[PDB]
Design a protein around this ligand. Structure first.
Ligand SMILES: Nc1ncnc2c1ncn2[C@@H]1O[C@H](COP(=O)(O)OP(=O)(O)O)[C@@H](O)[C@H]1O
Lengths: 114, 44, 373
């Protein structure tokens, strides 16, 4: 897992989010099934909810609010990449400026699956 | 020898070639110089 | 348009290199590697492990000359890497990462030669694209005709290949291991009869200079023997580097005659004229009269004075009398292959045929057999 560790007096939110997904009650311990549920939801195949698609195109975009076709083309067939480029719009950042290559998955997912 | 210390690869280069005034080897030396001279620790 | 490609001809004797789209190569230099053999006593002169190319020719007195390419095959790959590095950096002064390279090699060669050449030109020099071509096809480009049989004789190997209307017949390609180095060795052997003895590798270049300067192909062999026996008008005088004067005489037209009669060397194979005729007869019936009219000579070994008349007369004797035989020898036939390379390297339709770096990465060095030829 891409988790930087032991920064000099700094707090990161990835480990906190993982701990909340595993043990939301802050029990301090994870059982065999508590980690197995995370492993099963992280491993493969079937999907329960669209929220994992929501925050997994964020991880595919490496935390960026916009994604590119080149980033999508190391994981996905160019058939589906052409589909995505045809049906998903251009990204607008919080500053308001528009990249020519900026693509928003948030609006697309909330439009089709919401 | 200082250039060889920096592991810059020179071929068919000699001191007597530079002293004698050979054109091609001098130009090659200049060309080669131009190309080649411009805790978390505990967790891992 | 964008960046121009590099054209490199690696014959067995001499290496030639230049930019694509140019008329003549920029760098022409012998393919030798020299290393010293005596003791070194002067402290502070600096060291030099190897002498590459022309630099080894001037200081050849204190070196043992070694040839990396033998009979068209690369035997010592390290010296080939040294020669290629010297060509790229000292002779042309170009970074190899920006340019594609086009290379030349013989018709019939071992597979490992091409595989190792592709691996070397991709792995170390990091060229973006590369290609391998047959030398005689490039000669047919240099001539500018679509149909003909082309015979190329270098320092390593002689080969004949016929091409009709852009299609090359693979079963009619003939390869013969009789070239300029064998003629140089035969000249070294027959110069013993007059009393001159050359043994070390330094004197081989002197014998080669003698052969290039004072040798010619006799039109009629026995008549020239009679003439040289009758008079002394055929003798010529040459001056050695140390100042002695030698006089060849009879051996001027006996060294290049050995191409037409390989039994002088002990070889069982036929002459070059019979090889060309047999390679013509291996083809089909309908294209033979076109091949008779478009015979092309290529390579440096065919630069003897009087080679064209002897070849035309021999092939006229062997062929049926009802057809005409013409031999097309351009005056600049030494560099013909390289010129053809330039004509190939900057065609618009050729740009889709380079071996891409990604293709090599995903295919290994075995991609060169699927492409090229
Ligand atoms: N002017 C010449 N006359 C006769 N023979 C020559 C001449 N120039 C070169 N040669 C012969 O051709 C050889 C060089 O041929 P070259 O074209 O360099 O072969 P390759 O390029 O295929 O190695 C020399 O070894 C020499 O024997």
């Amino acid at each position: 897992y891409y988790l930087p560790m032991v920064e000099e007096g700094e707090s990161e939110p990835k480990f906190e989010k993982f701990l909340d997904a595993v043990d939301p009650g802050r029990k301090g311990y994870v059982t065999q099934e508590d980690y197995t549920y995370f492993l099963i939801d992280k491993e493969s195949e079937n999907i329960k909810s669209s929220d994992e698609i929501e925050n997994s195109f964020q991880a595919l975009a490496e935390g960026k609010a916009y994604i590119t076709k080149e980033d999508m083309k190391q994981a996905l067939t160019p058939e589906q990449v052409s589909f995505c480029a045809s049906h998903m719009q251009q990204y607008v950042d919080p500053r308001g400026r528009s990249h020519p290559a900026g693509y928003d998955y948030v609006g697309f997912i909330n439009s089709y699956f919401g | 020898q200082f250039l060889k210390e920096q592991r810059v690869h020179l071929e068919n280069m000699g001191s007597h070639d530079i002293v004698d005034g050979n054109h091609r080897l001098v130009l090659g030396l200049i060309w080669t110089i131009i190309l080649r001279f411009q805790s978390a620790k505990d967790a891992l | 348009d964008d960046i121009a490609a590099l054209v490199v001809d690696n014959g067995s004797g001499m290496c030639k290199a230049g930019f694509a789209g140019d008329d003549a190569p920029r760098a022409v230099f012998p393919s030798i590697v020299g290393r010293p053999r005596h003791q070194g006593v002067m402290v502070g002169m600096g060291q030099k492990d190897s002498y590459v190319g022309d630099e080894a020719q001037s200081k050849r007195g204190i070196l043992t000359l070694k040839y990396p390419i033998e009979h068209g095959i690369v035997t010592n790959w390290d010296d080939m890497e040294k020669i290629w590095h010297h060509t790229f950096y000292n002779e042309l002064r170009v970074a190899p990462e920006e340019h594609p390279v086009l290379l030349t090699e013989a018709p019939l060669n071992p597979k490992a030669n091409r595989e190792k050449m592709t691996q070397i030109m991709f792995e170390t020099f990091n060229t973006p694209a590369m290609y391998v071509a047959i030398q005689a096809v490039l000669s047919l480009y240099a001539s500018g005709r679509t149909t003909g049989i082309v015979m190329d004789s270098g320092d390593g190997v002689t080969h004949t290949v016929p091409i009709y209307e852009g299609y090359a017949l693979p079963h009619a390609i003939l390869r013969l291991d009789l070239a300029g180095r064998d003629l140089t060795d035969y000249l070294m052997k027959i110069l013993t009869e007059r009393g001159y003895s050359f043994t070390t590798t330094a004197e081989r270049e002197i014998v080669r200079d003698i052969k290039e300067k004072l040798c010619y192909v006799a039109l009629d062999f026995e008549q020239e023997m009679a003439t040289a026996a009758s008079s002394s008008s055929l003798e010529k005088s040459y001056e050695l580097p140390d100042g002695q004067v030698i006089t060849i005489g009879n051996e001027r037209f006996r060294c290049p005659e050995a191409l037409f009669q390989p039994s002088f060397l002990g070889m069982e194979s036929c002459g070059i004229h019979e090889t060309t005729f047999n390679s013509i007869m291996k083809c089909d019936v309908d294209i033979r009269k076109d091949l008779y009219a478009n015979t092309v000579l290529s390579g440096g070994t065919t630069m003897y004075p009087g080679i064209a008349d002897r070849m035309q007369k021999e092939i006229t004797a062997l062929a049926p009398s009802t057809m005409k035989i013409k031999i097309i020898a351009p005056p600049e036939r030494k560099y013909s292959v390289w010129i053809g390379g330039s004509i190939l390297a900057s065609l618009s339709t050729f740009q889709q045929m380079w071996i891409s770096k990604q293709e090599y990465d995903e295919s290994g060095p075995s991609i060169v057999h699927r492409k090229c030829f």
